């Protein structure tokens, strides 16, 4: 029986999974998660999987900072006096969860100005029998960064907005293209999301 | 942005580095003086590495390459001005009576031999019964 290591939180849209490297030979795993001054909630008991879901706990309070640890129960059984374990990096979901790849909802050229709507993807954070939209969790902290260009020779002309809508003038000479990128400027890491699927008219 | 029927044409910023996508050469071809071209070129690829406020203490930023160069000011060591040390051990010679060890801008005081210092640093006191 050996301790786990390389514990990491693979989270996107608050879908948090804790994963560890060493393979379970004659060994099973169990993971507990708790806040700074909370109660150690145990999950994924005796499982041989090298990963465990933790979304249903961080969804309770995304703003708190969470600490987790993974024991290693010898296969067959408890331990002698204490299981052998290893902690995990402290994960505050609000400042760390990766933003999902945004999708463009619609785009229309009213007059000479285009109107690039952005679809609002939902997150794993729950409420009264419904998932919370991305805007419903971040609000003012969520801005966007559109890139538009001529189909040939690219030429990204960046633009910014604080809404799921856009209103930008064009030359009425060539079908522009769009690629949005949900940006949270109030973070320090994972600030910018991956670029949206390209959409052109 | 070396499109057809170009180069021999007069230079232009927008028509090259914004409409389409100009290269570095097409950059200087428009701006001549290299420094000013950098003034744009460090923005074109490396969007802006200091649009946040990483370097504290009102750290002005030039934002060149993606390495995020920032200007730090006096009274604060480090590039981000984050080191909040009082520049030396010279302040009251380390809040003391004689001097302070300058162990990499730390605060570790000492007195003279036979004049043992306190744990944190205060007036020197005789060590034995007849110092």
């Amino acid at each position, epitope marked *: 029986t050996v301790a786990a290591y390389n514990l990491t939180w693979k989270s996107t849209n608050f879908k948090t999974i804790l994963e560890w490297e060493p393979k379970p030979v004659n060994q099973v795993y169990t993971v507990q998660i708790s806040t700074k001054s909370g109660d150690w909630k145990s999950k994924c008991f005796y499982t041989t999987d090298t990963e465990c879901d933790l979304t249903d706990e961080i969804v309770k309070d995304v*703003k708190q900072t969470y600490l987790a640890r993974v024991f290693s129960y010898p296969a067959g059984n408890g331990s002698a006096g204490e299981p052998l374990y290893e902690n995990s990096p402290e994960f505050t979901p609000y*400042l760390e969860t990766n933003l999902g790849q945004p999708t463009i909802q619609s785009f229309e050229q009213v007059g000479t100005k285009v109107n690039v709507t*952005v679809e609002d993807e939902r997150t794993l954070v729950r409420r009264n029998n419904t998932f919370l939209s991305l*805007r*419903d969790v971040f*609000g003012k902290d969520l801005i966007y960064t559109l890139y538009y260009w001529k189909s040939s020779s690219s030429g990204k002309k960046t633009a910014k907005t*604080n*809404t799921n809508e856009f209103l930008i003038d064009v030359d009425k000479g060539e079908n522009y293209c769009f690629s949005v990128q949900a940006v949270i400027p109030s973070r320090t890491v994972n600030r910018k999301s991956t670029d949206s699927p390209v959409e052109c008219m | 942005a070396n499109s057809f029927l170009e180069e021999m044409k007069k230079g232009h910023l927008e028509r090259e580095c914004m409409e389409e996508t100009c290269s570095y050469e097409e950059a200087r071809e428009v701006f001549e003086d290299s420094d000013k071209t950098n003034e744009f070129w460090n923005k074109y690829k490396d969007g802006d590495q200091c649009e946040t406020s990483p370097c504290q203490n009102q750290g002005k930023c030039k934002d060149g390459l993606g390495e995020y160069t920032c200007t730090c000011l006096e009274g604060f060591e480090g590039k981000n001005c984050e080191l909040f040390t009082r520049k030396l051990c010279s302040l009251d010679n380390g809040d003391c009576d004689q001097f302070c060890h300058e162990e990499q801008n730390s605060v570790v005081c000492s007195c003279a031999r036979g004049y043992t210092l306190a744990d944190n640093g205060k007036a020197c006191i005789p060590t034995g019964p007849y110092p």
Partner: antibody
Framework: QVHLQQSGAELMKPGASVKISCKAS????????IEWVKQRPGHGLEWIGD????????NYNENFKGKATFTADSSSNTAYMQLSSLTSEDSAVYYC?????????????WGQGTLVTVSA | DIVMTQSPSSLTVTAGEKVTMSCKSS????????????LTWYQQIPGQPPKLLIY???TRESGVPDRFTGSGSGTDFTLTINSVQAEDLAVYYC?????????FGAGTKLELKR
């Protein structure tokens, strides 16, 4: 529960600079916007600007550019606000606040309020 | 910048009936992405910090009594107090909670008619 213990009341001469503090307790300090609201009597409320601790991002009101500066040290879980070159217009009651939970949900928890007076 | 216009500067009411308030806004606060109106109400009894009343212009903060109620959409917003008690005597402030910079209203004094 939670509380925001601001500093005491001050009486500065004109041209001086006050340093209001606001200690946060009961919640995760680095994951909530710490606001600042100025309330001169007979003028209602007037948002000054906020800082997100840890990240350090700030959003100053334009009419308070230079006048108000927000710093934050997360080790002690207290914010700081500094008003420079005080005048008779700075004699007001300032507050700090903590943003709500589900995004742009107001200022859930307010400080007790700090009275600042400037006069010759 | 958004300007907010509390229509009653100072309204009086006998304790017991229903009151209604208005808080206009220059730019509409309705975000079309999720159909929420991002304005916050506040209650401030004099000498006390302003307790939050309603966020998103319709949702009661945990602890707010069940008589305060927000309504309206777009640019016109309304706060309703039913069966006014002696504790309701305060100045209420609406807030732009959509776009930086955040701007507060002019307030609305509440008086006990006699």
């Amino acid at each position: 529960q939670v509380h925001l213990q601001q500093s005491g009341a001050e009486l500065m001469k004109p041209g001086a600079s006050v340093k209001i503090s606001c200690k946060a307790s009961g919640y995760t300090f680095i994951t909530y916007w710490i606001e600042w609201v100025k309330q001169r009597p007979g003028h209602g409320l007037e948002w000054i600007g906020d800082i997100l601790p840890g990240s350090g991002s700030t959003n100053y009101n334009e009419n308070f550019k230079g006048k108000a500066t927000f710093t934050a040290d997360s080790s002690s879980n207290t914010a700081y606000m500094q008003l420079s070159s005080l005048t008779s217009e700075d004699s007001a009651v300032y507050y700090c606040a903590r943003s709500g939970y589900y995004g742009n949900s107001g200022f859930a928890y307010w400080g007790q309020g700090t009275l600042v007076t400037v006069s010759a | 910048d958004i300007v907010m216009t509390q229509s009653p500067s100072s309204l009086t009411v006998t304790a017991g009936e229903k009151v209604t308030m208005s808080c206009k806004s220059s730019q509409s606060l309705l975000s079309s992405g999720n159909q929420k109106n991002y304005l916050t109400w506040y209650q401030q009894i004099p000498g006390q910090p302003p307790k939050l009343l309603i966020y998103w212009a319709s949702t009661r903060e945990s602890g707010v009594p069940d008589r305060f109620t927000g309504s309206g959409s777009g640019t016109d917003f309304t706060l309703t107090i039913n069966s006014v008690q002696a504790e309701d005597l305060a100045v209420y402030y609406c807030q732009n909670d959509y776009t930086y910079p955040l701007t507060f209203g002019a307030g609305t004094k509440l008086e006990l008619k006699r």
